Amino acid sequence: ADGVGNASGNWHCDSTWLGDRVITTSTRTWALPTYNNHLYKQISSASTGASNDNHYFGYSTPWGYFDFNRFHCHFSPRDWQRLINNNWGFRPKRLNFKLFNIQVKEVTTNDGVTTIANNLTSTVQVFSDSEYQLPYVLGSAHQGCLPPFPADVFMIPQYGYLTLNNGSQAVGRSSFYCLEYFPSQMLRTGNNFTFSYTFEEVPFHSSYAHSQSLDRLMNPLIDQYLYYLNRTQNQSGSAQNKDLLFSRGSPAGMSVQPKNWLPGPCYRQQRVSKTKTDNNNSNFTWTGASKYNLNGRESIINPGTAMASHKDDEDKFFPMSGVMIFGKESAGASNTALDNVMITDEEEIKATNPVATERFGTVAVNFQSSSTDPATGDVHAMGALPGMVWQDRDVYLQGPIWAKIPHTDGHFHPSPLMGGFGLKNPPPQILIKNTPVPANPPAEFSATKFASFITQYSTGQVSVEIEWELQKENSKRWNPEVQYTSNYAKSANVDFTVDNNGLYTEPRPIGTRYLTRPL
Amino acid sequence: ADGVGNASGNWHCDSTWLGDRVITTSTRTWALPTYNNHLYKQISSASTGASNDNHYFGYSTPWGYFDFNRFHCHFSPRDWQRLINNNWGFRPKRLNFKLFNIQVKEVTTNDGVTTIANNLTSTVQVFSDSEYQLPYVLGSAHQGCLPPFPADVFMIPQYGYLTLNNGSQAVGRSSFYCLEYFPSQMLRTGNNFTFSYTFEEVPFHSSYAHSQSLDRLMNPLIDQYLYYLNRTQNQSGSAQNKDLLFSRGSPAGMSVQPKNWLPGPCYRQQRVSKTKTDNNNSNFTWTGASKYNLNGRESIINPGTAMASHKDDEDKFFPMSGVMIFGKESAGASNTALDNVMITDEEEIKATNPVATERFGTVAVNFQSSSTDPATGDVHAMGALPGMVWQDRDVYLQGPIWAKIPHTDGHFHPSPLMGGFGLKNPPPQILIKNTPVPANPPAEFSATKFASFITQYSTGQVSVEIEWELQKENSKRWNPEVQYTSNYAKSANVDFTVDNNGLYTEPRPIGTRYLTRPL
Amino acid sequence: ADGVGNASGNWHCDSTWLGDRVITTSTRTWALPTYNNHLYKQISSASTGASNDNHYFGYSTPWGYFDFNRFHCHFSPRDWQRLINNNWGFRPKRLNFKLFNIQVKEVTTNDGVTTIANNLTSTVQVFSDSEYQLPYVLGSAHQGCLPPFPADVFMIPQYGYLTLNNGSQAVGRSSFYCLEYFPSQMLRTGNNFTFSYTFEEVPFHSSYAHSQSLDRLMNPLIDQYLYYLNRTQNQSGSAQNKDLLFSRGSPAGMSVQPKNWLPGPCYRQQRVSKTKTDNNNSNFTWTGASKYNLNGRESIINPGTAMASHKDDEDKFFPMSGVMIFGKESAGASNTALDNVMITDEEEIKATNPVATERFGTVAVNFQSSSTDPATGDVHAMGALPGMVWQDRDVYLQGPIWAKIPHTDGHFHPSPLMGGFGLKNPPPQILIKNTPVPANPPAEFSATKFASFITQYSTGQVSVEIEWELQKENSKRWNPEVQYTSNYAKSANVDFTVDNNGLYTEPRPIGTRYLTRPL
C-alpha cells in the first residue's frame, strides 16, 4: 500500500544470462477500458447467417485479461539470436507477474469536449484463476499480448468464452460463469498486485536440426548380414521366368535395406505454390482442405501434424493449412496479399518427418498370384506405428509459448500443434476489470438495477519475469554450423527496428533450428 | 484507516463446502442517495383517500439500510442445487458484514450540465441496531436486498417505520425515533465498517418431503386388535333394523382404522384456477378473502397457515392468498398478467398437512336419536389439537431467510408464515446515511435551521458472509430420489443467466424439498 | 455361540418390585414361517374395488418382526392391580431384548404325509433398526404382539409398509426398502441375539382421577371481590326496563363466577347408545362420523381428542369413534355383536375435559343492540386456548404402550391419541427372517433367479425385560379410595384365567385411574 504520491513499482526490462539459465523481464504500460458497460452478455452466432460449421454460443464478460504468451513478449531479437545459435534446447521454469502504478481516470464529455481527470478513490479488480476454473482462453493465439517492442502501449483485450452449442442455441449442460463470483484484489492508485508461478517439468524444446536422416543411418562402407527379396523373376536371356532371388543389404541399395525405424505420423495436406500461375483456378481452400469432423461440424486441420513443408528444392510450395503464417504490420485482417504475410518453413524436420504435401507411402492392397497382379495404394493419413520417430513443430520469436493440455481421459503426445509447450497446469489467466462507479442515483428508491455509471478507464504498468533453462550444445562437429545472422550489407532500414514514423516491425519469422545433432 | 489512495477491502464472493458446513460470501457494489433532503418527515395515510383498512401513521427517515435477507443474496443457483439435492436440513450459524471502499461524490448542476466530483473529506454514518431499539423493518419481504447476480449494482432503500395509528392520526402512545440519537461510526473514503453476528439456536429447516402420509402409517398386512363401530343397522334381507356391529381395523379399511395422530392446523382459503374460464365472474379477491380483524381493521391472511396448495391432480388450483408469488423481471407493479408471476407450489406437505382450499374435516353438530337424524358440519378453521403434526412452509432461493419474532407474552410455533427462520434476536438492522454538508452560509448569523446543502451521494462495496450448518441425509431408500435438475435439452437461453442485453433472470422458484424421509 | 446340544438361554418371566421401580420380564415361545416365498412384493389397492378413501401403495416383505407394545405383554393382571391401586404414575425407563434357543426345521411333503426334521446348519437373520431408517409399523395397534398369557405360543407377523400413493398408483417420491440391505446377525441353532434400549425422558402417565373439577375450585364459603354483570334489565314491578346491574361472585353463583382456567380442547363426536332402540334407524357410522380430510382422502378421527365418554348418569352413551374398543376372545373380525366387544369408559376425566358428545360451549355470534337480539352459537370443535388444561387418554392393560412421534416441523402435545407414551426415539423395530435355502440346482448353469427352495420355518424363545419407574401416592385424603378389585362372590370361572379348554381370556378392560389427587 502506497499513497497517491508514491510509485508502487519500478520499470524492469532486462535479460540476464547465467550459466544454463536465462531470465527475461519485460515491463509494458497498459490501458483498460470498461467493457460491455459493466455487463455480462449472452453472445451467439444467431442471426449472423453463419454456416453450420461456424455456429457458437457463449458469453462476453466485463473483464479484461493479460496475455504474455508469445516469445517476443520476453526475448528481444538479439536475445532470441543468442538462444538459437548457442543452445540445443530450452524450457520455461518459473514465472513472476506484477501490476503496479495504477491510475484510474474518469472521462467527462460536454458538447464535443472530452475531459479526463484522476479519480483517486476508484479501484480495479484483479485475480488470477489458479485452479483453472474458468474456460481457458489463452493458447488460441489471440492478439492482445504484450507488444514486442517495450515502448509500445497496449490495450487489454476483453475476456469471453464459449460453451456447448447446438446450432446457435445452448444445451442444459452449457455453463455460465460470473467472474465476480471469484475473490479478487481491489486496487486503488497506491496498491499493487503480484503473484508467482512455477512451470511443471516439460521436455526441452528441440532447437536443432538433425545432421542425419532416418533412412541414411547405416554405415556406407559395409554390407549387412540380412537378406531381402531382390527379384521375383530372373533375367536369363530368353524370357522372364518366375524366380526367388535374394540379396543382402549393400551400400548401393540403401533404399531396399532393412531398417529399425519409421518416419512419424502423416496427415496429408494439399500443396499450393507461392506462384499464382501454378495453382488450379478455383477456390479450393475450403473444399480441398484437410478437415476433421466433430459433432457434425467441420474444422480445418491447421497447422496440423508436424510435417516438413516441402521436399528438396520445392521451396516454392507450402502446405495449404499446414504452416504457421504471421502477418506483417502492413497486413489487413481479411484477404490480404501474399506480400503482407510471412509463411514459416518447417523444412528442417524432413530428416525424420514426412513431407506434409506427399503420401506417407504405399501399402499392399491385395493378394497377388499368378493370375492377379500385385496392387498397392497410397497412404495419405497414417497414425502412430511402433517404431515411428518424429520432431515436433518448431517455435518462433513471434509465435506462442504454451498451450493448456485439455483435461481428458487420453492424450497422444500432447504437444500443441501450433508449437510450444503443452502444460497440464499452464500459467493462469489473469483477469482485470474496472470497478463500476455509479452516477448520481435518484432521490427516491428504485429496485431497478443501475444502468448509469461514471465513465472511466485505467492504466498502469505490468511486469513479467520468466526464468528459462538452457540445454547446452555438446557437438564434436568439425565444420562451422549454420547460424542466424543479420545481413551485413547496407540497406535503408535496420531489421527489427522502428522506422522514421516510430513503427516497430519484425522483418521475418525466426525459428529455433540452426545447430545440428546426430540422429 | 487508510488514505485516499489505498483500498480498504477486497472483493470476496465465494462458497466453501466443508463437512457439514457451507460458508457463503457475497460482495456487491452499492449507491446511497441523500433521502428527504436530510429530513425526518411525518408520513400518514391522511388525504390519500385510503380505506379504513389501509390507514397508517409513521415517519420517513434520512437514513438508508442494508437488507441481505433473501437466499439468492448468498447461494448461487448451482449452490442452491447442491444444498437441496444433498441435505435434509440446514440453518444459519454466524454472520459477518463489511462496508469498505467508500466514495462520497458531490453533484453540481449548471444549466443542463451535471458534474460529479470526489469529495474526499465527506463522511457517511453507519451503525447497526444491536439492541433492537428501532422498529424492525426487515422481515416484511421488501425489495432492495442485495441483487441475486453479483455484478449488479443496487440502490440502498430508504428506512422508514410505522407506529400506532387511529385512522390517519396518531396516539399519545405513538413513538418517534431519531436515528441521529444513536451512536454511529463516521467514515471518510479511507475508513471501513465491520461487525459480526451469531445466530441463536434454531431448528434445521426441513428440506425433504415425507415418503409416507399420516393416514398410511399402518402395516398393510396385519389386522389391528382394536374394534370400531362398523354398522348401526344390520342388512338382513327384509328390512333395515337397528343394530350395533363392530369390526376390527383391517387393511381393507384403512380409512376407518384407529390412529394416533391428527393433521396440522387449518384455516381454509378460497380456491382459484390458473385457467380464467373456471373461476367465477366477479372480483372476489377482497370479498372472498380469508382475513383477520385487528382493531376494527381487516388484513388479508397471506400466505397464512402452512397448507398443501392442492390435492392430487388438481395442480391447476392454488390458494387465493395462500402461496408465495414471485414476480418475473417482466412483471409490472400492479395488475400484471399471470405469465409475469411465478406461483409456488406447496404440494409436498400434503402428507401431514391439510389442503389449503378444503375443509379440515367434519364434526358432529347434534345428538342423534330415533327421532332425529345425525348431523355433521364442516370445519373450515381448526386450531391446535393435541396430537397434530405439521410441516412448516418451504423456503425458496429468492424467498426470505429470517423474520423477527414479535416480542410478546405468548407465541404458538413462532415460525414465520412467509417461511424461514423465526428469530428472537435476528440479524440487526444496519443503517447508513450521507452526512449533511452545508452550503455556504450567509455572512450574518441566523438562528434558522440550514435548508441549503451540497448535493452528494456515496458508493462502495458491501460483503456479507454467512456460515450455514448442514444436516446430512441418512436414508436407506433403495430407489433413486427426485432431484432438482436443469433440462438437458437445447434451448435459446440457459436458465439463471444473463441474456444478450445483460439482464439476469431467474426462470422459476426453487424450493428445498426433494430428498425423502420416512414419516 | 453354543453347540447343538447346549441351550442358549433360560426362561425368565418375573416381576420385581423394588422401591420406586418395577421390573417386568416376559418370555414367550415363537414360530416364524417363510413369508412370500422369500420375495418382496409390490402391494396396492388396485383392482380391489376400493373407495378413494381406502387406496394404498406399498410393499410386503419376506421378514417378520417382534412386537411387544401392549401392557399385558409385561404386567400380569395381579401386577397391573398393584400398579394402579398404589401409584399416581409410571413410565418406562430401559429395555432388554433377547432371542435364544433357535430351532430351524425343514418341512417335506410326500403324498399327504408332512415330515418335519431339524436342519442344524440353517440360519435366521435378525437386526434391530436402531436409526429408524425403516417405516415404523409399531404403534398402529396391530395384532401379533406377545400373548398376554405366558404359556401361549405365538406366530410372528409379517412386516410390510406403505408409501406415498395417488389412488392405487405410486409417485416418484415413493420409497422402496430392501431389508437385506441392512446388516443383520445370522443365527444357527446355537446362536443367540440380544440388545438393550433406553427410553428417553417422558412424563409419568397420570394414573389417578382428580378429586376436584375445574369449575368447582373456589372456596364455597367466601365471596369474591370481582363483579360480573348480573342483569341487563331491572325487574321493578311494572315492566322490564334496560339496566346494568352487577353482582360479586358468591357461593350461590358458582356458574357465573370468574375463573382462571378453561377446559381442554374439543372435537365433537356423535353420541350412540348401547341400547339399539335409542339410536336412529340408518347406517350413520361413516356419514355421521368425525373425519379429517388429508389429500382429498377422508379418515375417521378415532379415538381422537381425549374427552369424557359421557356425562353423569349417561353411562349408556359412548362416542361413536371416540373410545378404545377391545374384542373378547369370542369376537369375529367383522360386524360382531356388542356382547363380543369391550368398550372402554373415559369418564374419569370429565373433571377437566369436555364430554366427547357435547358442544364445547357457546360463543357470541353478533353485535346486539336495542334493535337486534343477542345471538350465540355452539362450538363443536375448539382448538388450543391459553388457559386450557386437560388430561390425556388413559392406558389399559391390553392397550398400547408407546407410539413413535412423527418426525415433523411441528407438534402440539405429542401424546398418542390411542394412549400411552409418545416417543421421538421409540423402541426399535426388530426384524427376523428365515434365511433362504435353495433346493438342488440344475446341472447346467442358468442365470435365472432361483425359485426353488427347501421349505422350512423356525421357532425359539424371546425375552423382553422392561424397567418401569413409579410415582408414589402422597395423598392426605381421610376416607378410603376407590380400588380395582376382583368380585368376592362365587362364580363359575375366575377372572383372567384359562377355562376348561385351556383358553385364556381377559374379562374386561382395566384402566389406570383409581387413586385421586386434588386439582
Short mmCIF file of N, CA and C in Angstrom, two decimals, chain C residues 100-177:
data_model
loop_
_atom_site.label_atom_id
_atom_site.label_comp_id
_atom_site.label_asym_id
_atom_site.label_seq_id
_atom_site.Cartn_x
_atom_site.Cartn_y
_atom_site.Cartn_z
N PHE C 100 -33.25 -66.54 21.68
CA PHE C 100 -32.37 -67.65 22.01
C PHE C 100 -33.11 -68.96 21.77
N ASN C 101 -32.38 -70.06 21.93
CA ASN C 101 -32.89 -71.41 21.69
C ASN C 101 -33.52 -71.53 20.31
N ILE C 102 -32.78 -71.11 19.29
CA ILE C 102 -33.30 -71.13 17.93
C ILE C 102 -33.34 -72.56 17.42
N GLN C 103 -34.46 -72.95 16.83
CA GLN C 103 -34.57 -74.21 16.10
C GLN C 103 -35.09 -73.92 14.71
N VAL C 104 -34.33 -74.29 13.70
CA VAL C 104 -34.79 -74.20 12.32
C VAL C 104 -35.18 -75.60 11.86
N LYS C 105 -36.36 -75.72 11.27
CA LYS C 105 -36.90 -77.01 10.89
C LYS C 105 -37.32 -77.00 9.44
N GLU C 106 -36.95 -78.04 8.71
CA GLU C 106 -37.34 -78.20 7.32
C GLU C 106 -38.55 -79.11 7.21
N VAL C 107 -39.43 -78.79 6.27
CA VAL C 107 -40.70 -79.48 6.09
C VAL C 107 -40.68 -80.15 4.73
N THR C 108 -40.98 -81.44 4.71
CA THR C 108 -41.03 -82.23 3.49
C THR C 108 -42.40 -82.88 3.38
N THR C 109 -42.98 -82.84 2.19
CA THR C 109 -44.30 -83.42 1.96
C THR C 109 -44.20 -84.42 0.82
N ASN C 110 -44.59 -85.66 1.09
CA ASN C 110 -44.73 -86.70 0.09
C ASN C 110 -46.11 -87.32 0.26
N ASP C 111 -46.88 -87.33 -0.82
CA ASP C 111 -48.29 -87.73 -0.78
C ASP C 111 -48.97 -86.79 0.21
N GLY C 112 -49.76 -87.27 1.15
CA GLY C 112 -50.31 -86.42 2.17
C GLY C 112 -49.55 -86.43 3.46
N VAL C 113 -48.30 -86.88 3.44
CA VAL C 113 -47.50 -87.05 4.65
C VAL C 113 -46.52 -85.90 4.76
N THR C 114 -46.74 -85.03 5.73
CA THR C 114 -45.82 -83.95 6.06
C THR C 114 -44.82 -84.45 7.10
N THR C 115 -43.54 -84.29 6.81
CA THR C 115 -42.47 -84.69 7.71
C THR C 115 -41.67 -83.46 8.10
N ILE C 116 -41.39 -83.32 9.39
CA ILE C 116 -40.62 -82.21 9.92
C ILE C 116 -39.33 -82.76 10.50
N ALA C 117 -38.22 -82.10 10.20
CA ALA C 117 -36.91 -82.51 10.70
C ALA C 117 -36.07 -81.29 11.01
N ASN C 118 -35.14 -81.45 11.93
CA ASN C 118 -34.18 -80.39 12.21
C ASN C 118 -33.27 -80.16 11.02
N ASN C 119 -33.03 -78.90 10.72
CA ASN C 119 -31.96 -78.51 9.82
C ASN C 119 -30.98 -77.75 10.70
N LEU C 120 -29.85 -78.39 10.99
CA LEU C 120 -28.96 -77.86 12.01
C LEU C 120 -28.09 -76.74 11.48
N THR C 121 -27.91 -76.68 10.17
CA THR C 121 -27.00 -75.71 9.56
C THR C 121 -27.71 -74.49 9.00
N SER C 122 -29.03 -74.42 9.09
CA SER C 122 -29.76 -73.26 8.61
C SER C 122 -29.67 -72.12 9.61
N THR C 123 -29.90 -70.91 9.12
CA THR C 123 -29.83 -69.71 9.94
C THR C 123 -31.14 -68.95 9.89
N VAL C 124 -31.29 -68.05 10.85
CA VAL C 124 -32.25 -66.97 10.80
C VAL C 124 -31.47 -65.67 10.88
N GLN C 125 -32.03 -64.61 10.30
CA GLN C 125 -31.39 -63.31 10.31
C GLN C 125 -32.18 -62.36 11.19
N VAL C 126 -31.47 -61.59 12.00
CA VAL C 126 -32.11 -60.69 12.95
C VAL C 126 -31.36 -59.37 12.94
N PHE C 127 -32.10 -58.28 12.89
CA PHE C 127 -31.50 -56.99 13.18
C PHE C 127 -32.57 -56.09 13.75
N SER C 128 -32.14 -55.16 14.58
CA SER C 128 -32.99 -54.07 15.03
C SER C 128 -32.68 -52.85 14.19
N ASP C 129 -33.70 -52.08 13.85
CA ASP C 129 -33.48 -50.84 13.11
C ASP C 129 -33.31 -49.75 14.16
N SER C 130 -32.05 -49.45 14.46
CA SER C 130 -31.76 -48.55 15.57
C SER C 130 -31.82 -47.10 15.15
N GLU C 131 -31.58 -46.84 13.88
CA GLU C 131 -31.57 -45.49 13.34
C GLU C 131 -32.88 -45.09 12.71
N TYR C 132 -33.91 -45.93 12.82
CA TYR C 132 -35.27 -45.55 12.45
C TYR C 132 -35.35 -45.29 10.95
N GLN C 133 -34.59 -46.08 10.20
CA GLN C 133 -34.47 -45.93 8.77
C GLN C 133 -35.54 -46.68 8.00
N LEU C 134 -36.33 -47.38 8.63
CA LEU C 134 -37.43 -48.06 8.00
C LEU C 134 -38.75 -47.44 8.43
N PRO C 135 -39.78 -47.57 7.59
CA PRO C 135 -41.12 -47.16 8.01
C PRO C 135 -41.49 -47.85 9.31
N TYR C 136 -41.93 -47.07 10.28
CA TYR C 136 -42.12 -47.59 11.63
C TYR C 136 -43.56 -48.06 11.75
N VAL C 137 -43.72 -49.37 11.78
CA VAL C 137 -45.02 -50.03 11.77
C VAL C 137 -45.56 -50.31 13.16
N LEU C 138 -44.72 -50.26 14.18
CA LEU C 138 -45.23 -50.35 15.53
C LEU C 138 -46.05 -49.11 15.84
N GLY C 139 -46.93 -49.22 16.82
CA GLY C 139 -47.73 -48.08 17.20
C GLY C 139 -48.97 -47.85 16.37
N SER C 140 -49.30 -48.78 15.48
CA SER C 140 -50.60 -48.78 14.82
C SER C 140 -51.59 -49.73 15.46
N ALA C 141 -51.24 -50.33 16.60
CA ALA C 141 -52.10 -51.25 17.34
C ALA C 141 -52.40 -52.52 16.56
N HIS C 142 -51.40 -53.09 15.91
CA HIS C 142 -51.59 -54.33 15.19
C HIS C 142 -51.51 -55.53 16.12
N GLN C 143 -52.28 -56.55 15.78
CA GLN C 143 -52.19 -57.81 16.47
C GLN C 143 -50.90 -58.54 16.08
N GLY C 144 -50.53 -59.52 16.88
CA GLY C 144 -49.25 -60.17 16.70
C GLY C 144 -48.22 -59.81 17.74
N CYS C 145 -48.64 -59.10 18.78
CA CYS C 145 -47.80 -58.91 19.95
C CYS C 145 -47.67 -60.21 20.74
N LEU C 146 -46.71 -60.22 21.66
CA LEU C 146 -46.59 -61.31 22.60
C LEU C 146 -47.93 -61.58 23.27
N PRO C 147 -48.30 -62.84 23.48
CA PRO C 147 -49.60 -63.13 24.07
C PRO C 147 -49.64 -62.69 25.52
N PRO C 148 -50.82 -62.33 26.04
CA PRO C 148 -50.90 -61.98 27.46
C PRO C 148 -50.47 -63.12 28.35
N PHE C 149 -50.80 -64.35 27.97
CA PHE C 149 -50.62 -65.47 28.85
C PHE C 149 -49.32 -66.18 28.53
N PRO C 150 -48.43 -66.35 29.50
CA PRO C 150 -47.06 -66.77 29.18
C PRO C 150 -46.94 -68.14 28.54
N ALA C 151 -47.94 -69.00 28.66
CA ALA C 151 -47.82 -70.33 28.09
C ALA C 151 -48.27 -70.40 26.64
N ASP C 152 -48.75 -69.31 26.06
CA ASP C 152 -49.25 -69.34 24.69
C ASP C 152 -48.11 -69.17 23.70
N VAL C 153 -48.16 -69.92 22.63
CA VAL C 153 -47.17 -69.85 21.56
C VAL C 153 -47.73 -68.96 20.46
N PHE C 154 -46.95 -67.99 20.00
CA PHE C 154 -47.49 -67.04 19.05
C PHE C 154 -46.71 -67.08 17.75
N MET C 155 -47.41 -66.75 16.68
CA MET C 155 -46.84 -66.65 15.36
C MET C 155 -46.33 -65.23 15.13
N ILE C 156 -45.19 -65.11 14.47
CA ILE C 156 -44.59 -63.80 14.23
C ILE C 156 -45.26 -63.16 13.02
N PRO C 157 -45.67 -61.89 13.12
CA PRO C 157 -46.35 -61.25 12.00
C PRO C 157 -45.39 -60.83 10.89
N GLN C 158 -45.93 -60.74 9.69
CA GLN C 158 -45.16 -60.36 8.52
C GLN C 158 -45.00 -58.85 8.46
N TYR C 159 -43.80 -58.40 8.15
CA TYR C 159 -43.53 -56.97 8.05
C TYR C 159 -43.92 -56.44 6.68
N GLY C 160 -44.59 -55.30 6.67
CA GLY C 160 -44.91 -54.62 5.44
C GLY C 160 -45.09 -53.14 5.73
N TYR C 161 -45.10 -52.35 4.67
CA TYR C 161 -45.17 -50.91 4.86
C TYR C 161 -45.83 -50.27 3.65
N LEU C 162 -46.25 -49.03 3.84
CA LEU C 162 -46.87 -48.21 2.81
C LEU C 162 -46.02 -46.99 2.53
N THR C 163 -46.14 -46.47 1.32
CA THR C 163 -45.51 -45.21 0.94
C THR C 163 -46.55 -44.33 0.28
N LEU C 164 -46.10 -43.21 -0.25
CA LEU C 164 -46.99 -42.25 -0.89
C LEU C 164 -47.76 -42.92 -2.01
N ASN C 165 -49.03 -42.57 -2.12
CA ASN C 165 -49.86 -43.15 -3.16
C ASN C 165 -50.76 -42.07 -3.73
N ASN C 166 -50.97 -42.14 -5.03
CA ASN C 166 -52.00 -41.37 -5.70
C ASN C 166 -52.98 -42.39 -6.26
N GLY C 167 -54.15 -42.48 -5.65
CA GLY C 167 -55.02 -43.59 -5.95
C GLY C 167 -54.30 -44.88 -5.61
N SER C 168 -54.36 -45.84 -6.51
CA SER C 168 -53.63 -47.08 -6.33
C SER C 168 -52.23 -47.02 -6.91
N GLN C 169 -51.83 -45.90 -7.49
CA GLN C 169 -50.51 -45.81 -8.07
C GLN C 169 -49.51 -45.19 -7.10
N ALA C 170 -48.26 -45.20 -7.51
CA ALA C 170 -47.18 -44.61 -6.74
C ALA C 170 -46.76 -43.29 -7.35
N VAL C 171 -45.82 -42.63 -6.70
CA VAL C 171 -45.28 -41.36 -7.13
C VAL C 171 -43.77 -41.48 -7.08
N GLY C 172 -43.09 -40.70 -7.91
CA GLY C 172 -41.64 -40.81 -7.99
C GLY C 172 -40.96 -40.59 -6.66
N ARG C 173 -41.69 -40.04 -5.71
CA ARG C 173 -41.18 -39.78 -4.38
C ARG C 173 -41.41 -40.96 -3.44
N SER C 174 -42.16 -41.97 -3.87
CA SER C 174 -42.38 -43.17 -3.08
C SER C 174 -41.07 -43.92 -2.88
N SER C 175 -40.90 -44.48 -1.69
CA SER C 175 -39.67 -45.16 -1.31
C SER C 175 -39.88 -46.66 -1.29
N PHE C 176 -38.89 -47.39 -1.76
CA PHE C 176 -38.83 -48.82 -1.60
C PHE C 176 -37.64 -49.17 -0.72
N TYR C 177 -37.82 -50.14 0.16
CA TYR C 177 -36.78 -50.53 1.09
C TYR C 177 -36.52 -52.02 0.98
#
